[PDB]
Design brief:
The structure is a monomer. The chain is built from five helices and six strands; from the N terminus they run βαβαβαβαββα. Strands 1, 2, 3, 4, 5 and 6 form a six-stranded parallel sheet that branches. By secondary structure, the protein is an alpha/beta fold. The chain is globular and about 45 Å long. It has a single domain, classed as Flavodoxin domain (Rossmann fold, 3-Layer(aba) Sandwich), CATH 3.40.50.360. The structure holds flavin mononucleotide. The site of flavin mononucleotide (FMN) has 20 residues, from helix 1.
């Protein structure tokens, strides 16, 4: 079976909890993608056009800095990449992660939490941005359990 990493960004814990359930289900290592500068509540104010998150989402070239890379990334066969949905997209720190780690040859699978939006748009944009990677279809994990995770992974043929 594969060596599995569950990489994730979480600003308020929701995606971290999804990631923990996923990693427990598959016996995967978890890698929290930690921002070098933590996100405050003010940063996350989507009603303020001048908030850090609004400015990020308006600049597709922005690459929020990550504290520490995953040093043994080379050892993994499958890398799940989790995030909260921000304006129907992956947060830009996900781009920082992808661009800073060699994911060539690996199976790469997004997952997300949200306030209602589906994962599809964010996953489509990531696949189009990084078309050389081996992307598989991901899931919104707002409400999940081991049985649902296992069914998903059988559909996409990850083991
Ligand atoms: C800046 C910002 C933008 C968001 N945009 C969306 C959105 O487009 N659609 C949606 O359903 N939820 C949106 N949300 C809600 C988050 O996706 C949701 O609360 C997620 O579970 C937060 O995960 P976390 O606790 O790991 O940070 C947004 C939240 C923030 C802070």
């Amino acid at each position: 079976n594969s060596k599995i990493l569950v990489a994730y960004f979480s600003a308020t814990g929701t995606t971290a909890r999804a990631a923990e359930k996923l990693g427990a289900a598959v016996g995967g290592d978890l890698y929290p993608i930690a921002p070098a500068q933590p996100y405050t509540s003010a940063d996350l104010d989507w009603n303020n056009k001048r908030s850090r998150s609004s400015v990020e989402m308006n600049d597709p070239k922005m690459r929020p800095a990550i504290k520490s890379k995953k040093e043994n990334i080379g050892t993994y066969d499958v890398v799940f990449i989790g995030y909260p949905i921000w304006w129907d997209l992956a947060p830009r720190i996900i781009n920082t992660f992808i661009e800073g780690h060699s994911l060539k040859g690996k199976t790469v699978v997004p997952f997300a939490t949200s306030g209602g939006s589906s994962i599809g748009n964010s996953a489509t944009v990531l696949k189009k941005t990084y078309p050389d990677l081996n992307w598989k279809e991901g899931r919104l994990l707002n409400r999940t359990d081991e049985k649902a995770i296992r069914a998903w992974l059988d559909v996409i043929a990850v083991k």
